[PDB]
Amino acid sequence: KVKFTEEEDLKLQQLVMRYGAKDWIRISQLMITRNPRQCRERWNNYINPALRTDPWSPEEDMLLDQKYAEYGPKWNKISKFLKNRSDNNIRNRWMMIARHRAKHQKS
Numbered sequence: 032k033v034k035f036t037e038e039e040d041l042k043l044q045q046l047v048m049r050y051g052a053k054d055w056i057r058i059s060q061l062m063i064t065r066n067p068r069q070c071r072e073r074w075n076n077y078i079n080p081a082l083r084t085d086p087w088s089p090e091e092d093m094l095l096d097q098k099y100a101e102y103g104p105k106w107n108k109i110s111k112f113l114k115n116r117s118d119n120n121i122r123n124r125w126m127m128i129a130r131h132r133a134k135h136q137k138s
Contacts, residue, residue, distance in 0.1 A: 032107075033065070033069060033072075033073075033107055034065050034069065035062065035065055035069075035070075039062075040073050040077050043058075043070050043074065043077070043078070044077075044078050047074055047078070052071070055067030055068065072107060072111065075110075075114060076107065076114075076116075076117050076118055077118065077119060078117075080115075082115070082116055082120055085117075085120060086116070086124045086127075087113065087115075087120075087124060091109075091121075092128050094112075095109060098112060099125075104122070106118030106121040106122045
């Protein structure tokens with residue numbers, strides 16, 4: 032997980048809404064515990080395009096088995112390969128698709 036907790040990711044929606052999405056150096060001054068790119072990575076992988084409903088397809092499932100196998104549930108690194116979804120969508124959809132392979136229905 033990232034240094035800050037999801038609860039912070041919500042603060043980003045507010046602070047970033049006040050800065051728009053370009054003064055990360057300022058938002059980082061408040062919480063120097065993270066780099067400007069760390070909170071920005073959430074902007075596109077959490078709030079910016081309104082992906083409250085942008086679920087991926089088996090393409091990420093098969094291409095994720097390769098990335099996850101390396102990073103694992105770090106939707107922070109995966110969401111960067113999508114730039115179309117958010118960790119909240121991946122962490123949430125992976126549990127929907129992982130629920131099918133959870134038992135053995137995989138075959």
